[PDB]
Design a protein around this ligand. Structure first.
Ligand code: CLA
Ligand code: CLA
Ligand code: CLA
Ligand code: CLA
Ligand code: CLA
Ligand code: CLA
Ligand code: CLA
Ligand SMILES: CCCCCCCCCCCCCCCC(=O)OC[C@H](COP(=O)(O)OC[C@@H](O)CO)OC(=O)CCCCCCCCCCCCCCC
Ligand SMILES: CC1=C(C#C/C(C)=C/C=C/C(C)=C/C=C/C=C(C)/C=C/C=C(C)/C=C/C2=C(C)CCCC2(C)C)C(C)(C)C[C@H](O)C1
Ligand SMILES: CC1=C(C#C/C(C)=C/C=C/C(C)=C/C=C/C=C(C)/C=C/C=C(C)/C=C/C2=C(C)CCCC2(C)C)C(C)(C)C[C@H](O)C1
Ligand SMILES: CC1=CCCC(C)(C)[C@H]1/C=C/C(C)=C/C=C/C(C)=C/C=C/C=C(C)/C=C/C=C(C)/C=C/C1=C(C)CCCC1(C)C
Lengths: 39, 173, 65, 194, 57, 38, 36, 504
């Protein structure tokens, strides 16, 4: 485990939990909340 | 209906319990996808190979033929790679299992029981109760020897000594 | 349409045009495999870029010896 | 005991607030305490199984913290020395104890929990945290069984918090649990090698 | 080869395992795929409209 | 069978396209002749 | 001085696409003429 | 009628003639390979592999033949410089003739498939229209490609049944085709480790075989079938073009930056070996090691091979050529005859001076001589300027160690200026100019030409991929839009854009 490899794994984790999880979670919440009336 | 062996897991839908040794143990569920007859064929053949291998390890450690050189069983494998006896052994195994392929095809077609080559030359099992008891004993011994042969090989790999030799002086490391 | 021996041999291999799996099928596991492939490409790109230094992996002409 | 005053609809933590809709006071240890809305997007079977597993693992971990600092098996204290806590892990990895433990526990988890996870998430009768492991027929009475369930859950929470506390205690001072509680002042600390 | 007479209608999901669920996820027991797309997917639209001619024009 | 292929289509090129193509090819030759020669 | 075999490049690259365009135009014009 | 740019769309719904035109294209490509190999064999000079290798002569497909085993010729020579008494069939000529014969056979097959287009295999049993089950065809082709990749990496590269691939040392002195054992660790992802080729091909062949089994077995989801338009073959064209220009970018990068798959004895050195002073550092290290053994400068510099000194030269840099400076590298600075040796420049006081090397950016660079500290002690004026540090004033003398001029000391100003101009370019060499009438402007290696062609091809195929993805996803509005668009384009008419059921 080199420092560069540890930094790469930490970058993957930070990218997930900072960009992908929050954006996807907010998208899911607002899509479930603000729906479209298809009547 | 939960499994008899595993109380927290459901019994697999393909393991009704008619087969020998069918206690319901299948956590990963290979019987849910692949054919149970082919799996029992593979299990029985693995076990028979392993039982013969365990008996061979014991005998080879206790007695080697005088026209063969004296050595451990595991490193004899390369000696018979070079000499040609192992090629003969796998040649005859391949010759038997060429017809084994046909037997497996008949097993797929459902005209043969799993692991049933009808090989009873001495007539030991003819009564149905004794036949079922022998099936259970055979599968239990097959599983035990499948574990035991890997145990022997890995113990020789880590300790550089054979089975009864290690039981002689139990060196721990 | 003329019928040939090779055509009749290969006919079952081209006989299911338009046959689909209903619903989403295997899309989630496909996305999982695509994610793994993306991670693998990222790893090898950063190795070739020397942004990811691994033990015993010297990205250099001198590693040929 | 499952009474309605220690768990359920009656007692309600952070009073003056509303209970979550999914947290309907049916599971064990429901005191109405779910801030941050974790019970809305997460399956309660998965969360309950995770809580039970973490609690049991932390119980074993904390008992190891207490016992290793007091008594050591013959043979390990010569190979490892006076190491414990965060030093026993790195020496045991190179020794062979940690790799064997990882392999055996991972094999046990693979052949026990994963199919249990799948079945209890797909709708089997197996409750989360239930492996049916009842030797000596302990807790055969249902009221006693509920008492044991609630006690196990609360002691698992306590064990998780205590394990975190002891880990941080060694990460700061550099002493084991009983050594940390008998050496209360923060001075004269040794080296805490991670 | 996976067994015949396998479908996700008789197989109880409560009895699922690692291999069975991995088989379901990899498109196994797909005997419900008798449906076809029934869309041309090469049909270029040809519904041209004729504009009416005005007096100016 | 060997006969009328239903996918046979005629090919057109009006005079405007012919003149555009001639202009394009001749201008490209004018541009790249100096570089091919040297 | 000026490299040889570039005359071949310039002249063939000028002629061949011009040939292609002229053939296309004449073919199209004759098809139109026989359409009448 | 069809426009000139749509003439090939007649085989879009004709599978037999699609196969016919693919066969014709394959025959053309194979014939180009054969004819190019024959021409390169006609213009190749195998006499001196050290100072006139294949990349100095503009050989393009010869490096790719020599990369994975084909190194001998029916003429009795090898590209490694050795003599082969029994060449065997798979020489360069054998490969070229095999490609010509393959081109002819594929041409005949294309003729047959163009004439016999209405095969019953190409018609859907359910509908009767000519159709291709593209997902299962992809499964079959992926399985075939996995088998081919696994076989190549398991028998050809490893030498189990095959020649192996070209493996050289770190500095391109002793390179040959060797069997290559695969490396299954993280070192297989070292791009300069040739074991990665074998391990990659074995693992990727296994994975492709499994994926082909999966794609034959399992039908696509309806959502992916409708979304990607899997009933249309233009989505296959679009995704194939995308993958192809992805691969072209990958090969462009591995050619320009160098890897184990682009050795310097076949494609020439890279520009970053000149930028970093790679061969210069190696030569200095060897000379220092020889000086530490008690040798003098002449014996230390005479031990340097001519190949290693030839690599340390800016005329072999692929980043020194020109776009329209066509021809081989020998058409530029000339055909290399001999290494003249390492020049060491000394002033009237005996202090050593090094001519600053020309960077790859500069068409022209001023000739300046620095000392060991980095201070300009001598130089050459621009063309006719009044000078302060000129060669005539400082009295610079040059002494050569090693090479053809070993031991000679030149003290006259014109010769010292000439050799300083030559030392600006790196190692001083002797070039032959009357054989090809070399003009004297540097030209690029096959590495640089490959990089240029494939970078431009990848960039253009990006545009092609965009065009075909657009024509796939917008097939219904190919000839224009209808009157059903006017209601959708009203702002706020529908809640969801383009959905008629979400009307407010
Ligand atoms: C999986 C089963 C298996 C396998 C692969 C082998 C393989 C081998 N055995 Mg072996 N063996 C086995 C079972 C097996 N044995 C059993 C069950 C016994 C007890 C009867 C023996 C008794 C035995 C002896 C006494 C000797 C070997 C020897 C050998 C080696 C030379 C072949 C030979 O002459 O064997 C001959 C083995 C038999 C005829 C027994 C076959 C009985 C059934 C059919 C199996 C070879 C590596 C020789 C050796 O180690 O040479 C250095 C040797 O001297 N074996
Ligand atoms: C002790 C283990 C054991 C047991 C209980 C059985 C039992 C059985 N086997 Mg079996 N088998 C075994 C080991 C065993 N096998 C091994 C190791 C092999 C590989 C050589 C085979 C290969 C085999 C085949 C190919 C077939 C069977 C079949 C059968 C069934 C009918 C034959 C019978 O009555 O055998 C009774 C067997 C015993 C009582 C075991 C005697 C063990 C001796 C005493 C060992 C010798 C001592 C040694 C030197 C140490 C029966 C259920 C047949 C079947 O499926 O029919 C239903 C069949 O076709 N077996
Ligand atoms: C999370 C659980 C956990 C983990 C990961 C470990 C891990 C470890 N323990 Mg340990 N231990 C535990 C729980 C745990 N323990 C519990 C609950 C007890 C009380 C019975 C002990 C009592 C204990 C002693 C007395 C010793 C260790 C030692 C060790 C180390 C050597 C491995 C070994 O022999 O373990 C042995 C662990 C057990 C036998 C516990 C098994 C009990 C469960 C119920 C099964 C290793 C780092 C040795 C050490 O410190 O090395 C210097 C040592 O001498 N453990
Ligand atoms: C002390 C805390 C505690 C308590 C109250 C329980 C309670 C329970 N467990 Mg449990 N468990 C615990 C710790 C605990 N567990 C730990 C640490 C593990 C990991 C090894 C497990 C692993 C486990 C499994 C795998 C299973 C249970 C099950 C059960 C339930 C039925 C069994 C029973 O009556 O146990 C009675 C337990 C006690 C009276 C605790 C005895 C503690 C001893 C005295 C400690 C030994 C001293 C030591 C030196 C420190 C019951 C709710 C079963 C279940 O879910 O069925 C409903 C089941 O399958 N448990
Ligand atoms: C119920 C569990 C529990 C208990 C009994 C304690 C008890 C204690 N903690 Mg503590 N702690 C806990 C959980 C717990 N903690 C948890 C969960 C965390 C994680 C956030 C911490 C993080 C923590 C830190 C960071 C420090 C303490 C410190 C201390 C001690 C201060 C007195 C002292 O040594 O001087 C005291 C004994 C201090 C200490 O080690 O002594 C100064 C200290 O600096 N704790
Ligand atoms: C990707 C396309 C590509 C690339 C990078 C090169 C690269 C090169 N070609 Mg080349 N060539 C190509 C396609 C290509 N060729 C094609 C398609 C033809 C047929 C028209 C030729 C015909 C050709 C000739 C006739 C010659 C080259 C020569 C050269 C070299 C200057 C250089 C190695 C020259 C060279 O040095 O070869 C000896 C040379 O004389 N090429
Ligand atoms: C795998 C490669 C590939 C394939 C199979 C196709 C196939 C097709 N393209 Mg296409 N295209 C590609 C790459 C490809 N393209 C790339 C990379 C670009 C970006 C430059 C384009 C840009 C493009 C446009 C803009 C259009 C097409 C069209 C078409 C269709 C009509 C055929 C045609 O234009 O011939 C017609 C005949 C000719 C073009 C002959 C003229 C000679 C050309 C201009 C120069 C000669 C090239 C030389 C040899 C090429 C060397 C090779 C290494 C590239 C056909 C389905 C047309 C379409 O979809 O219509 C429905 C259309 O309008 N393509
Ligand atoms: C996420 C879980 C996926 C899951 O829950 O699948 C379930 C979801 C479909 O769920 P429904 O229950 O609506 O669909 C019925 C299904 O049984 C399929 O018809 O599948 C998709 O939406 C796949 C598209 C997203 C696939 C791309 C992301 C996959 C994750 C990659 C990591
Ligand atoms: C490669 C090679 C060779 C070789 C070789 C060979 C033949 C190597 C063979 C290796 C083998 C067979 C290893 C088997 C291991 C079995 C294990 C670990 C089973 C564990 C079962 C457990 C833990 C059960 C657990 C349990 C379960 C699940 C159910 C009940 C509960 C519990 C009991 C706990 C040679 C010798 C020919 C030489 C050649 O030159 C090189
Ligand atoms: C990394 C590493 C290693 C390691 C390691 C290890 C052992 C890492 C273990 C880390 C652990 C177990 C951390 C746990 C922390 C628990 C906390 C903070 C609990 C907080 C509870 C709170 C705040 C409660 C709040 C509350 C709530 C919710 C509301 C009510 C009020 C209240 C109850 C207060 C090794 C051993 C491999 C060595 C390696 O060389 C380095
Ligand atoms: C100038 C130019 C334009 C822009 C791009 C770029 C700059 C790269 C450059 C590239 C131009 C291109 C695409 C050139 C293409 C060259 C090609 C395709 C050359 C291929 C020629 C094919 C040849 C001889 C085939 C010979 C085969 C023969 C006899 C077969 C004969 C036989 C047959 C027919 C039946 C069986 C028996 C036998 C003897 C085998």
């Amino acid at each position: 485990m080199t420092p560069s490899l540890s930094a790469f794994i930490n970058s993957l984790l930070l990218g997930l939990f900072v960009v992908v999880i929050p954006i996807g979670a907010a998208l899911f919440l607002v899509s479930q909340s603000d729906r479209v009336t298809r009547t | 209906d939960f499994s008899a062996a595993v109380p927290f897991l459901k019994r697999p839908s393909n393991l009704d319990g008619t087969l020998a040794g069918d206690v319901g143990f299948d956590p990963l569920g290979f019987s849910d996808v692949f054919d149970l007859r082919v799996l029992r064929e593979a299990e029985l053949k693995h076990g028979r190979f392993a039982m013969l291998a365990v008996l061979g390890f014991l005998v080879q450690e206790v007695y080697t033929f005088p026209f063969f050189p004296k050595m451990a069983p595991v490193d004899a494998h390369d000696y018979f790679v070079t000499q040609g006896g192992g090629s003969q052994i796998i040649f005859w195994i391949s010759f038997v299992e060429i017809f084994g392929v046909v037997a497996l095809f008949e097993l797929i077609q459902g005209k043969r029981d799993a692991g049933d080559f009808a090989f009873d030359p001495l007539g030991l099992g003819k009564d149905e109760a004794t036949l079922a008891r022998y099936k259970v004993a055979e599968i239990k011994h097959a599983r035990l020897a499948m574990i035991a042969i890997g145990g022997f090989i890995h113990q020789f790999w880590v300790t550089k000594q054979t089975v009864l030799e290690q039981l002689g002086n139990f060196q721990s490391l | 349409a003329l019928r040939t021996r090779l055509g009749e041999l290969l006919r079952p291999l081209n006989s299911e045009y338009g046959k689909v799996a209903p619903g989403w099928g295997t899309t989630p596991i496909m996305g999982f495999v695509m994610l793994l492939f993306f991670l693998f490409l990222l790893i090898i790109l950063q190795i070739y870029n020397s942004s990811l230094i691994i033990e015993n992996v010297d990205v250099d002409w001198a590693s040929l010896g | 005991y499952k009474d309605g005053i220690i768990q359920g609809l009656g007692v309600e933590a952070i009073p003056g607030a509303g209970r979550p809709a999914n947290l309907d006071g049916t599971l064990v240890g429901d005191v109405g305490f779910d801030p941050l809305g974790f019970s809305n997007w997460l399956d309660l079977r998965w969360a309950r199984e995770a809580e039970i597993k973490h609690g049991r693992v932390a119980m074993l971990a904390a008992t190891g913290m207490i016992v290793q600092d007091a008594y050591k098996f013959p043979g390990f204290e010569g190979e490892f020395g006076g190491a414990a806590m965060m030093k026993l892990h790195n020496l045991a990895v190179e020794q062979g104890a940690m790799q064997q433990l990882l392999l055996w526990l991972g094999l046990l988890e693979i052949i026990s929990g994963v199919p249990a996870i799948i079945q209890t998430l797909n709708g089997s009768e197996r409750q989360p945290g239930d492996f049916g492991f009842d030797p000596l027929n302990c807790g055969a009475n249902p009221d006693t069984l509920a008492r044991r369930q609630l006690t196990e859950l609360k002691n698992g929470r306590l064990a998780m918090i205590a394990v975190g506390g002891m880990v941080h205690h060694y990460l700061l001072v550099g002493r084991g649990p009983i050594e940390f509680i008998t050496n209360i002042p923060n001075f004269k600390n040794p080296l805490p090698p991670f | 080869k996976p067994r015949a007479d396998l479908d996700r209608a008789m197989m109880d999901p409560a009895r699922d395992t690692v291999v069975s669920s991995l088989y379901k996820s990899l498109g196994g027991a797909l005997d419900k795929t008798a449906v076809y797309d029934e869309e041309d997917q090469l049909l270029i639209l040809s519904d041209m409209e004729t504009f009416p001619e005005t007096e100016l024009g | 069978m060997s006969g009328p292929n239903p996918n046979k289509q005629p090919v057109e090129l009006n005079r405007t396209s012919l003149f555009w193509g001639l202009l394009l090819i001749f201008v490209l030759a004018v541009l790249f002749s100096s570089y091919f020669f040297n | 001085n000026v490299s040889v075999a570039a005359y071949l490049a310039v002249l063939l690259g000028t002629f061949i696409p011009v040939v292609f365009l002229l053939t296309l135009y004449i073919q199209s014009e004759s098809r139109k003429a026989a359409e009448t | 009628g069809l426009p000139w740019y749509r003439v090939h769309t007649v085989v879009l719904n004709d599978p037999g003639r699609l196969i016919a035109v693919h066969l014709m294209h394959t025959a053309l490509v194979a014939g180009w390979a054969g004819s190019m190999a024959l021409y390169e064999l006609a213009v190749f000079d195998p006499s001196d592999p050290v100072l006139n290798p294949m990349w100095r002569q503009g050989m393009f497909v010869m490096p790719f033949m020599a990369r994975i085993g084909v190194t001998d010729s029916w003429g009795g020579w090898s590209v490694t410089g050795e003599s082969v008494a029994n060449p065997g069939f798979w020489s360069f000529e054998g490969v070229a003739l095999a490609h010509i014969g393959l081109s002819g056979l594929l041409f005949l097959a294309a003729v047959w498939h163009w004439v016999y287009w209405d095969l019953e295999l190409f018609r859907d049993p359910r509908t009767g229209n000519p159709a291709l089950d593209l997902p299962k065809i992809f499964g079959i082709h992926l399985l075939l490609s996995g088998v081919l990749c696994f076989g190549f990496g398991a028998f050809h590269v490893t030498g189990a049944w095959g020649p192996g691939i070209w493996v050289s040392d770190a500095y391109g002195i002793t390179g040959k085709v060797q069997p290559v054992a695969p490396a299954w660790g993280a070192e297989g992802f070292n791009p300069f480790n040739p074991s990665g080729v074998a391990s990659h091909h074995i693992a990727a062949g296994i994975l492709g075989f499994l994926a082909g089994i999966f794609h034959i077995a399992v039908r696509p989801p309806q959502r992916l079938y409708r979304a990607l338009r899997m009933g249309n073959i233009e989505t296959v064209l679009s995704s194939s073009i995308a993958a192809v220009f992805w691969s072209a970018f990958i090969t462009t990068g591995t050619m320009w930056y160098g890897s184990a798959t682009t050795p310097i004895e076949l494609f020439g050195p890279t520009r970053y070996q000149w930028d970093s002073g790679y061969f210069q550092q190696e030569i200095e290290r060897r000379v220092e090691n020889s000086l530490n053994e008690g040798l003098n400068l002449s014996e230390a510099w005479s031990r340097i091979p001519d190949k290693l000194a030839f690599y340390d030269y800016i005329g072999n840099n692929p980043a020194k050529g020109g776009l329209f400076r066509a021809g081989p590298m020998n058409k530029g600075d000339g055909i290399a005859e001999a290494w003249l040796g390492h020049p060491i420049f000394q002033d009237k006081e005996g202090k050593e001076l090094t001519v600053r090397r020309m960077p790859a950016f500069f068409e022209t660079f001023p000739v300046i001589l620095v000392d060991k500290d980095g201070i300009i002690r001598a130089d050459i004026p621009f063309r006719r300027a009044e000078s302060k540090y000129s060669i005539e004033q400082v009295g610079v003398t040059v002494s050569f160690y090693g090479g053809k001029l070993n031991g000679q000391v030149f003290k006259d100003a014109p010769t010292v200026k000439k050799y300083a101009r030559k030392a600006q370019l790196g190692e001083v060499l002797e070039f032959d100019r009357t054989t090809l009438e070399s003009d004297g402007v540097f030209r690029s290696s096959p590495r640089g030409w490959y990089t240029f062609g494939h970078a431009n091809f990848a960039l253009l195929f990006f545009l092609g991929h965009l065009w075909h993805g657009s024509r796939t996803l917008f097939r219904d509005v190919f000839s224009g839009i209808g009157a059903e668009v006017t209601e959708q384009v009203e702002f706020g008419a529908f809640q969801k854009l383009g959905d008629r059921s979400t009307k407010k």
